Amino acid sequence: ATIHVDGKEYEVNGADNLLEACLSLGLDIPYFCWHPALGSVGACRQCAVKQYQNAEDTRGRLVMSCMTPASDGTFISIDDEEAKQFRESVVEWLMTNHPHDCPVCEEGGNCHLQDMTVMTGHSFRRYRFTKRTHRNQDLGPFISHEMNRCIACYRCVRYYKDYAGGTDLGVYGAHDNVYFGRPEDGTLESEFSGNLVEICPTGVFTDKTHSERYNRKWDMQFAPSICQQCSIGCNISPGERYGELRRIENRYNGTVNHYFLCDRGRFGYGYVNLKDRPRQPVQRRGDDFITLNAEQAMQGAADILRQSKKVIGIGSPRASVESNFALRELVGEENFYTGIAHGEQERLQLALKVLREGGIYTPALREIESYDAVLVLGEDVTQTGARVALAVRQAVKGKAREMAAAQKVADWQIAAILNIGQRAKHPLFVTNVDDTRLDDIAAWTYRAPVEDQARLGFAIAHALDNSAPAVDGIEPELQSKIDVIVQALAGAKKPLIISGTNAGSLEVIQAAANVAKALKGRGADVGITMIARSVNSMGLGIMGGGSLEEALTELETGRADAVVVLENDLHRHASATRVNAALAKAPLVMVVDHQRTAIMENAHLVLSAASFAESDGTVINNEGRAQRFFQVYDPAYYDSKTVMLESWRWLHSLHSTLLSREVDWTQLDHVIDAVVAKIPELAGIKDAAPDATFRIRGQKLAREPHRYSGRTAMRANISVHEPRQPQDIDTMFTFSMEGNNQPTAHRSQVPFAWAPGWNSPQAWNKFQDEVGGKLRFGDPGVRLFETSENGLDYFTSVPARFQPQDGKWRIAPYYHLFGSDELSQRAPVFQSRMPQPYIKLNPADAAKLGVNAGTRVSFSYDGNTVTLPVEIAEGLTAGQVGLPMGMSGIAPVLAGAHLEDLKEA
């Protein structure tokens, strides 16, 4: 389409509204109520432009650019005097009741209302009357509520209700006393409630965790990083100040996590700031703990490694690709063991085989929102891969989108779309051991043991394609619901099958592969998604190696007398007694880790590794996307004695000191070149981000904003002499504001969004090619593998149905977004949000046990008797007992194990 803005001719998309079209052209129009992801409603009335009927029209008419289509031959004026006057008037009317709060408001310097007040040119108050005031609510540990600062733009309710699907936030009241909050005091229940701190253009909803240690946005040191709290790999902007990680902002990625995170990745960063972390290499000599610097730690470790016969290396899915590869090089490929259990590894490599050999294209997180039918098999997506649950919700609303497009209603007119598609939605079929959080929009939910979920998947595959193995013993009502699922999946243009390794069953993954293969055989545009457990689970799977059980066998048999444990606590993948005995048998245990784990008491050397904030590296998505994360800050800038290096740096120097008896603190690109030379299936990680020699017209990329304060005083209490700026030889980023962060720079890694006049998270519009699209020069990250030309075979290992046998209790895994992940549950703000340890029981099983809700039962697993209080679960099946995976004393490896002696304490 062709539009004329102030006499200048522009070529735009005719299916867009004028606000998004003009923001994509770099024109500045103030706006509040519109969001690129939420659509247009026309509430705030801020985005007024003046429209003319034709070129020879002078009087015009004020139209609202977010509710006006950018059609062909459009004539608008942004800089008309009447339009400018009305936009200033709208800002003024908002300012009539606004509190005098900017110095004591966490949004200050990051406030979209501040930006638009300045942009409209309103700085003179002529209102002399009183301001309305509001009481605040308690919204839990993460979100702080201040209703005085509200401008009634309805973005919070539109996001939280129409988009995120939450049910406990609403708008109450009338004319000018509208109140946005919960119906009563209490914790916000949605797993995506954290995105309110960036959706809300004012300081009503703010990060309480950041408000504890607040610093303004210009004072942050930002870096582009990847969230480490599950496998989805959402792009984040961690920002630090005075040597501690302060905030996790969302970093826009038009391919993965566009505007939104989940609450785990947004609020579980606090393990970085723990005071019991290793900050220096420590050697155990007798009962003494001798602190070493880097050189003598490497010398002592190298001498002990050289005098030993066999050295084994136990990696982790927490650690980066470079760190795991460095351990693999240090100990040898045949001596390298993945730190996960055998069953977890088998499920992980099956998921990898389905992804990169099954011939079915695995979608990105953004592309999930365009699929016409969703089948979720075994995976509690909301508790393990939450952003996939949000994308599934958008794909479910796709049906109302199609219905509204049939009536020639534009895509941005969200209220008309939601009105036309009243309760019609795309088919969603979830399976779990109990209820999920997707049941509100699920067309059907199947609560069954993992064997029965796998059997339902195999039966769906057999009904879609008869060449798939048949399932015997399907009940007639279950067969009718299977036929319902088959009619929904067969008629869909774009079906999507989601599964993962968290269900604890190989057969669930096989059934999901069978359903996807059966749908692909009918010519459907089927996609498959696998949810891995940790941030680098697929990277550790691609690298490969033995299981943790094999490493413990080597340690127990005495064939290995030296073990190097990289970023692994070893208790979440094996029994603690066996791990403790095997590590106590070894004459050298060396733990390279950044968190104080329980295996450091037996360790003879502890290398203080760096976390994601203090390190660079590469991690692989659950969809196989290689993504670089860069270091946020130098840990040694404030504490000079802190020796906290990257894990791959420690291990590469240990290998060099073992070989040639000299330390070698290498560079990151050297390690990446070693990875892509030795492991050809990881060759895509070279293109994940450019090397350390990348420049924007000769200058590095800035980590901190250009108005960074306190340069000559932030360290003055330690020494009045200003230290040297920290040198970053590893990446293209500089540890200063002497660098480039221009929105028109030819890069893809943006540490933070800021433009002159846009200090808010709305500054991301400048860094994108079109608003709500991708970044201007493409999103960061690269897929490791393409869709295979040829598929797999049908898996014919159909399990039998679940038989509840006496004395045994099948452990059904329950996952919690706050508690199942290890590092995030170590973060101190999560203990308030964490559930209490509750063991879930069927009413029939609890009645048989003589146990009611709340009383404490004792059960022995692996010779260890532990006691938990009983919660009644109606949705569970008899013979199963529910356990929260990843919590204290309950390893996630218990998923699928049996239980003994479940009796009342």
Partner: protein, 148 residues
């Protein structure tokens, strides 16, 4: 009318089914706005809707909807029982038909009368409303309610 066969199923033997309900509101002026009337009928907060789409194509619960005033639907049966020519031949004005007009507020006879269009406000006020009360002088008037 339901008991007399004028409502329900198969009205007058035609086969037309029509069910009429009375929905009493809870007191907001904005509920009279037709899109906000639809929103209040759906059980939501009575915020209005942007048009287009108009309720004729996407109205109540997304279905086609026609919102009409009480007086328009009261005008309909006389039109269909006496004809079009009678309805255009009761007033020599561009607005056909009759309208309930009336003056209120410190007049001698405050009330409501059905008058053809084209009736001047002066003759309404003086003949039907009786003029103003004793010792009061006419200074202003609003022709059609509080919003005019």
């Amino acid at each position: 009318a339901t008991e007399a066969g004028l409502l329900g199923k198969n009205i007058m033997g035609t086969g037309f089914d029509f069910e009429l309900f009375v929905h009493t509101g809870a007191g907001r002026y904005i509920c009279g706005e037709e899109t906000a009337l639809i929103n209040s009928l759906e059980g939501r907060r009575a915020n209005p809707r942007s048009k287009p789409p108009f309720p004729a194509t996407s109205g109540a619960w997304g279905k086609p909807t026609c919102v009409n005033n009480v007086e328009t639907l009261c005008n309909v049966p006389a039109i269909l029982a006496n004809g079009v020519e009678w309805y255009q031949n009761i007033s020599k004005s561009k607005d056909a038909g009759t309208k309930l007009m009336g003056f209120s507020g410190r007049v001698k006879n405050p009330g409501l009368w059905e008058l053809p269009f084209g009736t001047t406000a002066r003759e309404i006020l003086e003949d039907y409303a009786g003029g103003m009360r004793d010792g009061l002088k006419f200074k202003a008037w609003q022709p059609g309610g509080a919003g005019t």
